[PDB]
Every structure is written in structure tokens, then in C-alpha cells.
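Exercise: predict the structure of this protein bound to NDP.
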Amino acid sequence: LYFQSMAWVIDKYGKNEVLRFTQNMMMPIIHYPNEVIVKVHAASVNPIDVNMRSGYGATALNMKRDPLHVKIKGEEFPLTLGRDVSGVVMECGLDVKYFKPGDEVWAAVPPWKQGTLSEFVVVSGNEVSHKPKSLTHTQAASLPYVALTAWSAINKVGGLNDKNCTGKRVLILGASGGVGTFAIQVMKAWDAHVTAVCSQDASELVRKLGADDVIDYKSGSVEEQLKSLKPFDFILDNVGGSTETWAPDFLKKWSGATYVTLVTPFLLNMDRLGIADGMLQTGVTVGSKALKHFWKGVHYRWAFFMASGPCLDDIAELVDAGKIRPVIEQTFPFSKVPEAFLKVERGHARGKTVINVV
Ligand SMILES: NC(=O)C1=CN([C@@H]2O[C@H](COP(=O)(O)OP(=O)(O)OC[C@H]3O[C@@H](n4cnc5c(N)ncnc54)[C@H](OP(=O)(O)O)[C@@H]3O)[C@@H](O)[C@H]2O)C=CC1
Ligand code: NA
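Solution:
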């Protein structure tokens, strides 16, 4: 009689033990005419998933989940994590025009929506794209969240594109993870010269992906090494913290060189101080740092993941043209999501961890 479906959900924030498997998920529902229901075939685990499991961003994300303050506390639960999906379209609302049942699609889901570690996921038409024809679901599911994060930082915030990168020198701090391994490749597709900073053991990987130079950040003479290279037109910082104290100094000055960071206290400030005071603090940091770097002749920018079907269509074109490859470290069956989370939580990513749902 009833329709039941499967998911990994959490009922409270905490350590990995909060993960719970249920075969009693309700059927997915189209609430708005621009939504699409997708059968999840594969999903990837992202550090944002492990962090959100522990409560990270809860304050800000709850405001996003319920703008009106019309829901009660703990109303996000049960919460399905997972941001990436490769799969097949089951149903569309009446305003979706470019997708239909049976299409093979991928998407990155915003953090404030129910996630993809489930049999089905509801997404908005503007977040979804036809997946690369050349990739399996497993391969494709590794890409959307990291690719869109990289795209936001590089293209949208950085202003770099296929026409203006030729012979620009790019530094990627943290080149061996999900974002970095995508970033190396999109930058080489646009003919930039790429310097990758990563651990010694990742060096072969990042070179095969197209890194021109590699710096081992534990080599103990990173400064003399960077000092020995020409300056950079662009730095993508995926490490953060102390990197900001030395890395901007290696950009060309007074030439529109840009430092973009993906590691910010945006969500942490609101967790610690609340929405109003956290947002204030974030603004003070943003404003003082932008001006201070402007005075030293560089643009300093923050960048964030942003969901985009149209950007995914551009990415799928690069994949199918052979310019971007998926980099999958490991796959886990659906029954081993907790194990996949522990692996991610242990660190030292070399590309991506994918969950096979089908
Ligand atoms: N603002 C935003 O919207 C987003 C920000 N991000 C940021 O980027 C990271 C997540 O991205 P992702 O690419 O998926 O993460 P990963 O976990 O897949 O990759 C991070 C990589 O960084 C390496 N690393 C750690 N320390 C250093 C260092 N000091 N120098 C060079 N490499 C280092 C790790 O390897 P090893 O430790 O072995 O060197 C690992 O390969 C997080 O820090 C996250 O905040 C991610 C998504 C969205
Ligand atoms: Na598969």
C-alpha cells in the first residue's frame, strides 16, 4: 500500500554516530512548479557534509530553511545530507520545460535544502543540468559541488574565462582535493600556467591533471621556492588561515591580480555570535581586508558555492570535450555512508569519495 523510500538522515547534530538509515522516508513531493524529482544513482561526500553533521552553519541554514520563522526549533530534522547527485528525472512541475522524465541529470543542491543521500531528491529546475554523456553516474556524481565552487571562485569572482587566461600564472593552494583537482584542469583548459601547492605524495596526480609546477608545502623552503618563481596573476586559496598572511605577497602588484579564498568565517561567525552580530563581524573583516589589500595593489575576494544548472551545462561540455576528468579516490555502497563519512573526516583527500545509491 504505502510508498516507502530509503535515506541516511540525522535527528540531531553530533559525531558520526548520529547517522541513521531509514526505509520509511515519505514519497518525494513537488511543492513548486519549477521543481524536478530525481532518482539518485550516485552522490558524493563533501567536507560541508561532515561539518553540517556536527552543527556547522545550523543557525544561518535554519534562517534559510524558514525565512518567516514559521517552523519550531529542531524542525530541520530528520535531515538528509549530501550535496551532489547524478541520476534520472522522475517528475517535473508544470513550469519545467527543458527536462522530462528519464533524462539523465546532475546537480549540486544548496546546503539549506534536503540532500542527496536518499533514493530521491527534489531540486529546482535552475539547479539541474543534463549530465556528461561520457561519464557513468558514479563518475559524474563526484563533480557538481566542487566544480561549481571552483567555477564561482575562478570565473564569477575571479573574472577568469576561456578568453583571458592564456599565459596567466595561477597558484592553487590545496591542489589535491575535490576543488583543487577540478581547478587545475579548468585552468589548463583555458591555457593558464598552473602552480599547484600540495603534499609530496599528491604531486604525480596534480601533474597528470595538468599542473606545470608543484610545491610541497611540507618541504620546509616554500618561501625560497615561491620567491624563486615569477609572481602570480591569480591565487585560489582552498586552505585558508595562515595562508593569507604570506600568499597575497606573491601576486603581481598594480596589475589587477586577484586573491580568491574559499575558506571564510561566514558561517562560523553566525554560529558563534548569532545572525546579526555574526553578519556584522563578517562585514568588518571583509571591508577591512578588501581595503588593506587594495592599498597593496591587489584584489582580495571571498567566493562561495552557488548552485547553477547553466554553469553545470558549461562544465558538462568541458567534460565531454575531454578537458576535465573526474578524480575519484574511493566509492562506497549506500549501506556504507557512515564509513564514507569517517574516511572524509580523516582528511588527506586525493580527489573525491562517491556513494553509489543505485
Ligand atoms: N566558501 C565555500 O563555499 C566552499 C569552501 N570550500 C573549502 O575548501 C575545502 C573543501 O574543499 P575540497 O576541495 O572539497 O576539500 P578536500 O577535503 O577534498 O581537499 C582539501 C585538500 O587540502 C589538502 N591540504 C590541507 N592543508 C593543506 C595545505 N596547508 N596546503 C596545501 N594543501 C593542503 C588536503 O591534503 P593534505 O592534508 O594531505 O595536504 C586535501 O587534499 C574546505 O576547506 C572548504 O571550506 C569547499 C566548498 C565550498
Ligand atoms: Na554506479
